[PDB]
Amino acid sequence: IMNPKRIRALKSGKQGDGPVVYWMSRDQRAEDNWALLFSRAIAKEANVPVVVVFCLTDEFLEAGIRQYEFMLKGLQELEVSLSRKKIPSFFLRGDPGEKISRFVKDYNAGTLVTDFSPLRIKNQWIEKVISGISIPFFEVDAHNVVPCWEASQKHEYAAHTFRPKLYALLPEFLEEFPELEPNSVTPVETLSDVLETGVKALLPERALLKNKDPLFEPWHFEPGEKAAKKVMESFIADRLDSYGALRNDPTKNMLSNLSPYLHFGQISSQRVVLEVEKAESNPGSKKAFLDEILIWKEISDNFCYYNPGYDGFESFPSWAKESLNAHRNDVRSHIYTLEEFEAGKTHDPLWNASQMELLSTGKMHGYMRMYWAKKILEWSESPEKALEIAICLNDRYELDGRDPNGYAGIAWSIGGVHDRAWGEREVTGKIRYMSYEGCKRKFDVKLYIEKYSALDKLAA
DNA sequence: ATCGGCTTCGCGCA
DNA sequence: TTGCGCGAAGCCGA
Ligand SMILES: Cc1cc2c(cc1C)N(C[C@H](O)[C@H](O)[C@H](O)COP(=O)(O)OP(=O)(O)OC[C@H]1O[C@@H](n3cnc4c(N)ncnc43)[C@H](O)[C@@H]1O)c1[nH]c(=O)[nH]c(=O)c1N2
């Protein structure tokens, strides 16, 4: 009934006479969720209800109010969404490995389902969970069109080798979603406290302007499943046609803007591809866009899955390692610390501008992110430091941060992963180089700089 | 084979 | 700002 290559058995065994509970984690949405549909499926063939369980963890302390509210404001809207289909959602606070354990016990779950994520800490949690349960345990890729473990059984060296695999698998996986049928059988803190608690927890780290005013502008992106869908519709109707020709222009904003929604799972990219595919646009712009949400977004999962040190210098390709190592003792033009990068006090004002876009909006322009990471590698004392600075700023300040897409982007920029070797230079070696004067022939750099000049002088 | 083609490069010049 | 060919560069896969 559903394509069963989207399921992997974690733990086998006997079905409890209790509810089917979805350990929701990555795909925080009620529609177009292959994982919650699997849950409803084996629930219905069991005459049991489905419930959903979410577990909140101290990981929010590692980022910002901006993300925590994006996720929490979302989950309030999910709660109404599930409840109106008779699906209870329960919200746990703590370590999954040992609270999902207690839950499975306290409620005698018939079976357990979770979505798929390649992040290391999730594979730790699944382990702590299996060790402590005896009921079955399933994982479902609800996040990729083509399940990650089916797309490829190895690390793909680049897109041109991955892309033929994905598209061969595409006609059998690109399909429509079925309706989420409500519970036939009507079947731990409240959500409002966790929001306010967390906020009081994070306020003293809040980026403030020099006049105590918060730096973040929460209005560029309304959180939520509802909201996500208006973003994609308006993008397919207004911006898709221009995506190819205007995407590399930080002065326009012809991006789809879906990445904070995708990251928190508030929208499936399968619904997106689906709607794009029937859309009558420029074939140029579709291909470019399909390629970003399909090849690049998914090889970003393949990356982390097959490379446990996805955030490490060790996961760069051999040639990139030799090159950067050969240039470790090169004199650097400038050397900034994390904090000088952080507050945009470099000599480059294009760079500082993108540091200001990231600080205030929560979302740096896809093209600028690539310049940003490279001038970090140029102006830091070592690669490993460069890498560690760009991760830290990516996850602290991007709304889409803490994401497979993030590590594999940084790897690309600093370490050449999924890229190729270019003319050898000082410091950066054979890693692909970008310049301010290459930026000038592509967009009106002065316009970008002008937009974010009013922040730097009043940052501290 | 073994060779072309490779996300998002820079640069000069029309 | 446009595009177009060339440049330096390591390596996958048909
Ligand atoms: C230095 C640096 C740092 C990061 C990233 C790249 C670079 C160069 N990326 C990837 C990319 O920059 C990001 O996905 C886009 O900016 C998404 O913004 P839009 O949704 O507007 O993209 P746009 O509308 O152009 O593309 C649509 C979608 O395609 C996918 N996509 C586009 N560019 C991609 C890329 N380079 N890699 C993978 N998937 C891509 C994403 O799902 C994106 O939502 C990333 N992404 C992310 O979600 N979180 C992050 O924290 C980072 N970090």
Side-chain angles (χ1 to χ4, degrees):
Chain A
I1 313 269
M2 178 193 59
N3 187 314
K5 280 200 177 27
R6 311 190 188 275
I7 317 174
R8 236 173 69 235
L10 300 164
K11 174 170 195 53
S12 319
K14 276 282 134 311
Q15 266 186 319
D17 297 9
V20 168
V21 60
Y22 167 37
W23 178 4
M24 179 186 298
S25 181
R26 189 183 201 189
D27 297 303
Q28 314 179 5
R29 72 184 173 271
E31 290 315 297
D32 302 338
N33 190 320
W34 281 126
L36 165 56
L37 286 156
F38 183 40
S39 297
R40 188 67 194 87
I42 51 196
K44 194 182 200 61
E45 265 179 281
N47 299 263
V48 306
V50 280
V51 300
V52 180
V53 51
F54 194 74
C55 166
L56 272 103
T57 76
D58 290 300
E59 212 204 340
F60 77 120
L61 294 198
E62 314 201 323
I65 311 206
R66 75 194 41 194
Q67 293 97 358
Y68 182 73
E69 268 193 33
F70 199 100
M71 202 190 78
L72 257 288
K73 272 163 107 197
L75 296 176
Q76 277 140 3
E77 190 207 310
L78 197 59
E79 212 205 37
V80 188
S81 292
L82 308 181
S83 73
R84 285 182 62 261
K85 327 192 60 53
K86 309 198 125 168
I87 304 140
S89 36
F90 297 112
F91 288 118
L92 309 183
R93 179 68 180 78
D95 163 46
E98 304 294 3
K99 291 267 180 161
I100 302 307
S101 84
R102 283 304 312 249
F103 205 74
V104 177
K105 200 215 326 184
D106 291 7
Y107 296 80
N108 199 115
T111 67
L112 185 57
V113 193
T114 184
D115 44 57
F116 163 86
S117 167
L119 293 192
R120 279 178 319 255
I121 201 58
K122 181 64 183 312
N123 314 334
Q124 295 290 316
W125 285 331
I126 294 172
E127 292 312 321
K128 240 70 172 299
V129 151
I130 302 171
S131 22
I133 70 173
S134 65
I135 74 164
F137 192 15
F138 304 94
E139 203 183 27
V140 178
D141 203 347
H143 212 92
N144 299 303
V145 177
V146 173
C148 181
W149 54 82
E150 290 287 322
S152 180
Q153 281 68 35
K154 202 201 160 302
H155 154 88
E156 294 301 313
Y157 172 69
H160 68 81
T161 73
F162 180 53
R163 163 195 288 107
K165 298 154 179 257
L166 205 59
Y167 283 77
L169 284 176
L170 212 71
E172 188 213 352
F173 285 89
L174 191 39
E175 61 200 320
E176 204 54 68
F177 283 88
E179 222 195 49
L180 173 68
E181 201 184 21
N183 259 336
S184 49
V185 198
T186 50
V188 192
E189 324 107 58
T190 171
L191 207 57
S192 55
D193 298 29
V194 196
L195 187 44
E196 187 184 317
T197 298
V199 169
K200 281 188 218 297
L202 286 158
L203 271 170
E205 307 279 324
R206 231 189 153 193
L208 289 182
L209 268 62
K210 213 171 299 174
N211 49 81
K212 324 296 195 276
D213 227 66
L215 205 14
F216 179 61
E217 306 182 341
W219 67 86
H220 302 278
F221 298 112
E222 183 91 340
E225 195 170 1
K226 250 174 306 159
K229 197 218 192 63
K230 275 284 132 198
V231 167
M232 158 212 62
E233 258 170 341
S234 89
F235 160 76
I236 295 190
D238 301 353
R239 287 173 285 174
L240 181 53
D241 235 341
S242 305
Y243 185 72
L246 300 180
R247 61 196 168 100
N248 297 319
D249 195 344
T251 57
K252 321 298 203 308
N253 176 44
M254 292 292 110
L255 297 196
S256 80
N257 282 141
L258 298 157
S259 51
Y261 302 101
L262 288 158
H263 158 77
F264 292 122
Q266 304 190 8
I267 196 167
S268 174
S269 54
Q270 185 168 341
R271 169 65 49 203
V272 166
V273 179
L274 264 177
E275 304 297 326
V276 167
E277 282 276 1
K278 305 218 184 176
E280 191 55 24
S281 227
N282 188 40
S285 271
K286 298 177 73 185
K287 173 147 184 255
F289 185 86
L290 281 173
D291 256 24
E292 297 290 340
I293 196 144
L294 274 181
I295 305 314
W296 286 109
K297 155 173 184 304
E298 290 211 22
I299 205 187
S300 284
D301 264 23
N302 168 285
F303 180 51
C304 300
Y305 193 72
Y306 297 100
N307 292 86
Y310 48 80
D311 49 353
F313 184 93
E314 182 73 354
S315 59
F316 296 172
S318 278
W319 66 265
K321 268 143 86 52
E322 313 195 337
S323 182
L324 297 182
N325 282 337
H327 292 272
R328 281 201 187 254
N329 270 318
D330 288 5
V331 64
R332 269 74 175 143
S333 268
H334 309 81
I335 301 164
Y336 303 100
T337 61
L338 214 161
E339 309 73 286
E340 286 160 68
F341 287 122
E342 201 176 359
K345 307 272 177 297
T346 66
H347 65 292
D348 192 336
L350 185 42
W351 197 97
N352 297 340
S354 43
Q355 185 52 39
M356 295 304 146
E357 173 168 65
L358 171 53
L359 287 171
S360 54
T361 67
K363 178 151 180 312
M364 214 194 282
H365 192 261
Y367 189 90
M368 287 316 300
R369 295 202 210 191
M370 188 192 16
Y371 181 87
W372 181 86
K374 297 173 167 310
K375 299 303 163 182
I376 298 167
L377 168 74
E378 230 167 293
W379 310 324
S380 59
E381 60 183 317
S382 60
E384 295 99 322
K385 217 68 51 183
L387 186 51
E388 101 199 17
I389 283 156
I391 294 178
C392 173
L393 290 184
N394 183 94
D395 307 2
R396 172 57 181 91
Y397 290 113
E398 298 289 353
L399 283 162
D400 53 29
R402 307 225 259 25
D403 197 274
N405 272 6
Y407 309 106
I410 299 195
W412 188 87
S413 297
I414 290 156
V417 162
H418 293 142
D419 194 4
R420 59 182 183 95
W422 302 82
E424 174 155 47
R425 313 183 88 277
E426 267 153 26
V427 184
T428 48
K430 300 194 191 99
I431 299 310
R432 175 203 291 258
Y433 174 68
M434 286 178 90
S435 55
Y436 177 102
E437 302 68 353
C439 272
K440 264 211 314 216
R441 22 201 305 177
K442 300 192 198 154
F443 58 97
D444 184 339
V445 174
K446 284 180 77 60
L447 246 62
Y448 193 62
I449 274 150
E450 174 224 22
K451 192 171 190 75
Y452 303 104
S453 188
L455 310 183
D456 42 292
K457 325 272 211 305
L458 41 87

Coordinates of all heavy atoms in Angstrom, one line a residue, chain A residues 203 206-216 458-460:
Chain A
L203 N 17.5 33.9 27.1 CA 17.5 35.4 27.0 C 18.9 36.0 27.2 O 19.4 36.8 26.4 CB 16.5 36.0 27.9 CG 15.1 36.2 27.3 CD1 14.1 36.6 28.4 CD2 15.2 37.3 26.2
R206 N 21.0 36.3 24.2 CA 20.4 36.9 23.0 C 21.3 38.0 22.4 O 21.9 38.8 23.1 CB 19.1 37.6 23.5 CG 17.8 37.2 22.6 CD 16.6 38.1 23.1 NE 15.7 38.2 21.9 CZ 14.7 39.1 21.9 NH1 14.4 39.9 22.9 NH2 13.9 39.2 20.8
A207 N 21.5 37.9 21.1 CA 22.2 39.0 20.4 C 21.5 40.3 20.6 O 20.3 40.5 20.2 CB 22.4 38.7 18.9
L208 N 22.1 41.3 21.2 CA 21.5 42.6 21.4 C 22.3 43.6 20.6 O 23.5 43.5 20.4 CB 21.5 43.0 22.8 CG 20.5 42.2 23.7 CD1 20.5 42.8 25.1 CD2 19.0 42.3 23.2
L209 N 21.5 44.6 20.0 CA 22.1 45.8 19.5 C 22.7 46.6 20.7 O 22.4 46.3 21.8 CB 21.1 46.7 18.8 CG 20.8 46.6 17.3 CD1 20.3 45.3 16.9 CD2 19.8 47.6 16.9
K210 N 23.6 47.6 20.3 CA 24.2 48.3 21.4 C 23.3 49.0 22.3 O 23.6 49.3 23.5 CB 25.2 49.3 20.8 CG 26.5 49.6 21.6 CD 27.5 50.4 20.8 CE 28.0 49.7 19.5 NZ 28.9 50.6 18.7
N211 N 22.1 49.3 21.8 CA 21.0 49.9 22.6 C 20.0 48.9 23.2 O 18.8 49.1 23.2 CB 20.3 51.0 21.8 CG 19.8 50.5 20.5 OD1 18.8 49.8 20.3 ND2 20.6 50.9 19.4
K212 N 20.6 47.7 23.6 CA 19.8 46.6 24.2 C 18.7 46.1 23.4 O 17.9 45.2 23.8 CB 19.2 47.1 25.6 CG 20.1 48.1 26.4 CD 21.5 47.5 26.8 CE 22.1 48.3 27.9 NZ 22.9 49.5 27.4
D213 N 18.5 46.6 22.1 CA 17.5 46.1 21.3 C 17.9 44.8 20.7 O 19.1 44.6 20.3 CB 17.1 47.1 20.2 CG 15.6 47.3 20.0 OD1 15.0 47.9 21.0 OD2 15.1 46.9 18.9
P214 N 17.0 43.7 20.6 CA 17.4 42.5 20.0 C 17.8 42.6 18.5 O 17.2 43.4 17.8 CB 16.2 41.6 20.2 CG 15.1 42.4 20.7 CD 15.8 43.6 21.4
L215 N 18.8 41.9 18.1 CA 19.3 41.9 16.8 C 18.3 41.2 15.8 O 18.0 41.7 14.7 CB 20.7 41.4 16.7 CG 21.7 41.7 15.6 CD1 21.4 42.9 14.8 CD2 23.1 41.9 16.3
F216 N 17.8 40.1 16.2 CA 17.0 39.2 15.3 C 15.7 39.8 14.9 O 15.0 40.4 15.7 CB 16.7 37.9 16.0 CG 15.9 36.9 15.2 CD1 16.4 36.5 14.0 CD2 14.7 36.4 15.6 CE1 15.7 35.5 13.2 CE2 14.0 35.5 14.8 CZ 14.5 35.1 13.6
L458 N 26.5 49.6 15.3 CA 25.7 49.6 16.6 C 25.5 48.1 17.0 O 24.5 47.8 17.7 CB 24.4 50.3 16.4 CG 23.5 50.1 15.1 CD1 22.7 48.9 15.2 CD2 22.7 51.3 14.8
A459 N 26.5 47.3 16.7 CA 26.3 45.9 17.1 C 26.6 45.6 18.6 O 25.7 45.0 19.3 CB 27.2 45.0 16.2
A460 N 27.7 46.1 19.1 CA 28.2 45.5 20.4 C 27.2 45.6 21.6 O 26.7 44.6 21.9 CB 29.5 46.3 20.8

